[PDB]
């Protein structure tokens, strides 16, 4: 098992001696490495042309949050409120009150990307699969107050992307 890195030692044979001496005086390995970077000059550059091209991702990838509707057009969220109860950063805050119809609903679902750690526990937790960690990954913004999403904001994110998200979940759920 155990292996000796090094430990191997140079021969004192005169051909070898002259070789190492000529190596020192004439810099063989030096020019070797130099030739190596020469060799990497000729390979095709790895850069992608962002924005105009964008890097590969995955169906499972996590990003901006977004509550989302039934196809019926009704919202999914039902305030079982355990999204609050499982987020380690406890970013989420929820305050449900009854619908006039009598159905359970949120009044001010909110979240703040300032504290959220994008761990995707909320994505797992929801029994009705309401909140979803959306594919979008870019929403850097000027002002701190914008980070602190309101419920309406999440819905708008759910409106913007719904075909996309439904596509990911469609492509992914079997592995769940």
């Amino acid at each position: 098992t155990y292996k000796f890195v090094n430990m191997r030692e140079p021969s004192m044979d005169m051909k070898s001696v002259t070789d190492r001496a000529a190596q020192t005086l004439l810099w063989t390995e030096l020019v070797r490495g130099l030739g190596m970077t020469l060799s990497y000059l000729f390979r095709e550059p790895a850069t992608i042309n962002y924005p105009f091209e964008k890097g590969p991702l995955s169906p499972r990838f996590r990003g901006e949050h977004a509550l989302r509707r039934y196809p019926s057009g009704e919202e999914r969220c039902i305030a079982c409120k355990l999204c609050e109860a499982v987020c380690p950063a406890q970013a989420i805050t929820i305050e449900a009150e009854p619908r006039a119809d009598g159905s359970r609903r949120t009044t001010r679902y909110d979240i703040d990307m300032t504290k959220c750690i994008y761990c995707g526990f909320c994505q797992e937790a929801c029994p009705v699969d309401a909140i979803v960690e959306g594919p979008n990954f870019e929403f850097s913004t000027e002002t701190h107050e914008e980070l602190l999403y309101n419920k309406e904001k999440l819905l708008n994110n759910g409106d913007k992307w719904e075909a996309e998200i439904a596509a990911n979940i469609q492509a992914d759920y079997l592995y769940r």
Binding site: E95, E97, T107, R108, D110, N150, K151
Partner: peptide, 18 residues
Amino acid sequence: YSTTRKKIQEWVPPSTPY
């Protein structure tokens, strides 16, 4: 912005005298 309306909704004195 603030969401979920109000809290205590405290009462105020009547316009009518006495």
